[PDB]
Amino acid sequence: GXVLIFREIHASLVPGPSERAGRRRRGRRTGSPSEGAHVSAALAKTVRLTC
């Protein structure tokens, strides 16, 4: 699949509950990759489709 993308989806998982607890404001470095991680979420649909 793409274990790293598994990390990407896992990367969106973090901002979900954690952002609302601290990253609410700051985080202009992890928030960005998280967005791409979402796109990675779709690709993930393909990685899963793959292996």
From Swiss-Prot:
Location(s), subcellular: Cell membrane
Disordered: annotated segments: 17-37
Domain of life: Eukaryota
Tissue spec: Kidney.
Ranges in the topological domain labelled Cytoplasmic: 2-48
Subunit structure, interactors included: Interacts with ARRDC4. Identified in a complex containing at least ARRDC4, V2R and HGS. Interacts with TMEM147.
Family the entry assigns: Belongs to the G-protein coupled receptor 1 family. Vasopressin/oxytocin receptor subfamily.
Role noted for this protein: Receptor for arginine vasopressin. The activity of this receptor is mediated by G proteins which activate adenylate cyclase. Involved in renal water reabsorption.
Protein known as: Vasopressin V2 receptor
Species annotation: Rattus norvegicus
